């Protein structure tokens, strides 16, 4: 929950790469430097793409992070994100995240990117009905039933997956930007009632 007294960054963040990320974020001299909960409370954004991070253990102590860039790492477990109540924008492309249950109570999350994670089962995304942007390109998804609950989506990429049935998108009236290239789609009837689309890409299907 909280760091009660000042503690070395090295001790809170066991992943050597993530400890260095925190050191640089707070402009500290060394991962041996001690930080207070007050200093950790000052972190609202972490930029740590392409950083060879295997674990974000310790991030639980950053209650005020709203923007988290973790594209291109070696993550499989996002349980340390479970109680980051203020997370708004989350980028996790090119990891290997399959268990999405830790996203369930991220109720301020507006944007989620999980491209190229090898995902097939997205049932757990049903618990994010407030999402506005969702990027799932380059995965192994077939069944998008649960996206019918995500009635606030305005941007959705499902390109380069295994989808043939897009009926669950029929009621997503707020969609503006929809990317469906490189799937198995022949029948777009269910999209006929979407009135607010600016972008709809359907290139290169394999029927």
């Amino acid at each position: 929950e909280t760091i009660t007294v000042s503690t070395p960054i090295k001790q809170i963040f066991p992943d050597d790469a993530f400890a260095e990320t925190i050191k640089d974020n707070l402009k500290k001299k060394s991962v041996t430097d001690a930080v207070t909960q007050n200093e950790l409370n000052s972190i609202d954004q972490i930029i740590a793409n392409n950083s060879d991070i295997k674990s974000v253990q310790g991030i639980q102590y950053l209650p005020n992070v709203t923007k988290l860039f973790l594209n291109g790492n070696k993550l499989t477990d996002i349980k340390p994100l479970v109680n980051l109540k203020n997370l708004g924008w989350l980028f996790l492309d090119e990891n290997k995240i399959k268990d999405l249950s830790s996203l369930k109570d991220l109720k301020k999350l507006k944007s989620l990117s999980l491209e190229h994670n090898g995902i097939s089962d997205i049932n757990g995304l049903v618990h994010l009905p407030q999402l506005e942007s969702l990027y799932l390109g380059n995965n192994k998804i077939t069944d998008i039933t649960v996206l019918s609950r995500l009635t606030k989506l305005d941007t959705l990429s499902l390109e380069d997956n295994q989808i043939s049935d897009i009926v669950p998108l029929a009621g997503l009236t707020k969609l503006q930007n929809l990317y469906l290239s490189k799937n198995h789609i022949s029948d777009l009837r269910a999209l006929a009632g979407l009135k607010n689309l600016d972008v709809l890409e359907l290139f290169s299907q394999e029927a």
Partner: nanobody
Amino acid sequence: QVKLEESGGGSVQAGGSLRLSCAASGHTYSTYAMGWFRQVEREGVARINVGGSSTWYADSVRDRFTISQDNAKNTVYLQMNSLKLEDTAIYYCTLHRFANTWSLGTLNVWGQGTQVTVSS
């Protein structure tokens, strides 16, 4: 390998006008977001969906600036009218495939920047 070629800028008198251009090369996108940020921390100014029609403007420039595109030419244009002292800044062309991510800046392709100075 995405390249942003910026044209336009310099000094202008308050109340005057300036038009910036930015052309994107080396990409495959059917549609994408392109526009400008500025830095007087860097802030978004104007965005358009190249290959679509949606736009976004910062509140401070909304009705004075107009962004447009030549889709086939992969170029966007920023017509800056009724220029104000508050508009002096370095202006950066910038691009992302997805408009909502474009707004964050962090993941965008970035141009070199052009100096705009509004006097009097």
